[model samples]
Target: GAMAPSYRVKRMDIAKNDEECVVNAANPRGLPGDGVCKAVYKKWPESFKNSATPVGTAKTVMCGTYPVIHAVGPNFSNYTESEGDRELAAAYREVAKEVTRLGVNSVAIPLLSTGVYSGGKDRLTQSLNHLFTAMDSTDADVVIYCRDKEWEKKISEAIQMRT
Candidate 1:
């Protein structure tokens, strides 16, 4: 079962994640806006204001208590790509690798694209598939966090199928 690690779907906020790494939908331009970015920006304004000044798809910033993995969406810099799911899937791998590399036992991630990212209905299933696929092969206990009722249902179903 090494390639099928356990997963849990929860109705919660990504900003409140106490896991070693809380994945956030971020901008490579360093601008914290919408979705998890708003809560992240409000929580650690200093660290965000400082380190978030730069630009990139993958970066780590202090969220005051735990670490926030700022994984850039495929819509970064307004240059849209057709394969955002692939880009985001790669970003998930980046976050998973880095957190696991740092000895993290668990991590919480949002349902990227489908939410504030506005990646559409199709993006919902695509993002979830890519996310669980990446994490299912890792050792970490990955919690797929979702706040929206609809998203939570989809996430729950996904977890059910995985289990």
Candidate 2:
């Protein structure tokens, strides 16, 4: 059986996490316009290479303390439920690939599609499910960071259900 990576939900800023790497919910156009992407870009301006990152893929940028993994998750507003789910899962898988490739000991990731991407609460659950499943293939410990209390609780509960 494949071993699941250690998982935890924390209420904190993604950029503030002391993990080896932080995952950014980015756009295909690589624009750090709003949400977590903006915050990450503000801290590490070099993360923006002005290149297009297609959805369901990830690219890495080496920064000061931790490398930033830019993951382009599906924009739910434009995709059907099935497509969104598949793309979201693929995005997380790509992140896992990056984590393994970087040989990081730990990673901090946020709920990918549920922010300004229009992935509401339902997508939050989907994101968590796919994230946990995909990250399981990696050896690094995974931390799911969120700024909202309600999301913190929900994420905690979801982790419980999986564990």
Candidate 3:
């Protein structure tokens, strides 16, 4: 089934990128501050800060409730989009849970576990299947941004097809 056990992904590309502002996958320093947003702000002082976002940090910036957009890649910015991780579905589901906790229904993600994460095609497909399965059961309106055509196809199969 191409529609995947009867589910939807809001807008395959997040229908949601450049939202408010883009931040790293992890919440840096485990601090209370919006570290990644701060980093982007810090690195580009002149850049217009539409709004800052952080995953783990409380959803706020400049003392206001911002989107706190957490772009889901893999757990390893230190390695690659996908590295040092197994059970990609669980990982992605945890991310979805966190995003849900933030009260943001439409969140953005990429094809996790397919890149430098290096789990291989079988693992990648399995991971995507598990992730979508979890998503189908939830209300998270997901959007996965594939960097290239190869990724785009794999993810399309994952999101659009159930088997």
Reference-based TM-score of each model: 0.81, 0.90, 0.50
Full ranking by TM-score: 2, 1, 3
Better of 1 and 3 by TM-score: 1
Candidate 1 lDDT at 55 equals: 28
lDDT of each residue in 1-163, candidate 2, tens digit only? 1155578999977878878888999888878778888888888878677535899999987775468899999988888888888989999999989999898888889989988886454566778888988887688988899888998999998887867
Score each candidate by Cα lDDT. 0.67, 0.84, 0.43
Local error of candidate 1 at 129, Å? 1.1
Write model 3 residue lDDT over 1-163, tens digit each, in one string. 1132233333223323643322233333322223333343443333323332322222222214544333333334444333334434545555555555665555455444445433343345655665575556556455555445666676666666653
* Candidate 2 Cα errors over 4 Å, as ranges: 1-5, 119-121
C-alpha RMSD values across all candidates: 3.4, 2.6, 7.8
What's the lDDT for residue 87 in model 2? 89
lDDT of 1 by residue, 1-163 (tens): 1244567878877767766677777766667688777776776655464445222245777756577777765652343655565676787677666666656678878766555555344476777776766676678778878777887887788778756
